[PDB]
């Protein structure tokens, strides 16, 4: 996260760290959506251009964390994966269209002050909140500059008008993406960066005071953090895939 601030304790208790077993490293962010399901970006797991194609056993998720590097004894929980599910139409060839994946945990994680699931939006929450100007919030342990944070970082960014998103880039933007960030005139800045991807773009509903996950940190072009924007997977648009997977393969 570029130009963020340190997260408060328990501020983002659905935040998950995607952790490589060997060597020990942060791969990506992710989010807890129930006691055994973790949501992330497909490209965190499968990206052939970079010879990335992780199996379950290459990976751990670390839940309830604040510190990036420390083992947070008594606080964090580390879970192994039962199964990875990649959207069957995730487009790694072109533009990361449908950059979404689910991970089923071997065992349910215990909720605590530091570990708690985020809501997935309904049609109506999405329709009302996914508007240009409306700000969401992005969290992660990624780089601070296009170096690395001691603790989880947070930044609030406004959703951007679709034509402005499109005119900022040569990449073809689909309906399964939105972009967010400040414009050069706007005097405030911030963006996700390296290590943040797969993490959550959340918004707090003014109706029922609950945090909802609207986006997944998907891609950007640097971190320009002038005239560039971070792109997020549009979570509601893919929610039927999410539910299908969970209904079929969850117990």
């Amino acid at each position: 996260i570029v130009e963020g601030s340190d997260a408060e304790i328990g501020m983002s208790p659905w935040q998950v760290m995607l952790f490589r077993k060997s060597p020990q490293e942060l791969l990506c962010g992710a989010s807890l959506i129930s006691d055994r399901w973790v949501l992330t970006a497909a490209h965190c797991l499968l990206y052939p251009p970079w010879d990335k194609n992780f199996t379950e056993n290459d990976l751990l998720v670390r839940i309830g964390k604040h510190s990036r590097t420390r083992y947070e004894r008594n606080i964090e929980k580390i879970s192994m994966l039962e199964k990875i599910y990649i959207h069957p139409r995730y487009n790694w060839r072109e533009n990361l269209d449908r950059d979404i994946a689910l991970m089923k945990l071997k065992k349910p994680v215990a909720f605590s002050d530091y570990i708690h699931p985020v809501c997935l939006p309904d049609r109506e929450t999405a329709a009302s909140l996914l508007q240009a100007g409306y700000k969401g919030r992005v969290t992660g342990w990624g780089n601070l500059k296009e170096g690395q944070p001691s603790v989880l970082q947070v930044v609030n960014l406004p959703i951007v008008e679709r034509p402005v998103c499109k005119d900022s880039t040569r990449i073809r933007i689909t309906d399964n993406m939105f972009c967010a960030g400040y414009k050069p005139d706007e005097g405030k800045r911030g963006d996700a960066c390296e290590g943040d991807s797969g993490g959550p773009f959340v918004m707090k509903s003014p109706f029922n005071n609950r945090w909802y996950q609207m986006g997944i940190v998907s891609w950007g072009e640097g971190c320009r953090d002038d005239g560039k924007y971070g792109f997020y997977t549009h979570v509601f648009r893919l929610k039927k895939w999410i539910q299908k997977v969970i209904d079929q393969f969850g117990e």
């Binding site: 952790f19 020990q24 490293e25 942060l26 751990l60 670390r62 590097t69 083992y71 580390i78 192994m80």
Partner: peptide
Amino acid sequence: DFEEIPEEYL
């Protein structure tokens, strides 16, 4: 860079 996590997890 990271702190050694418990080996049970590995």
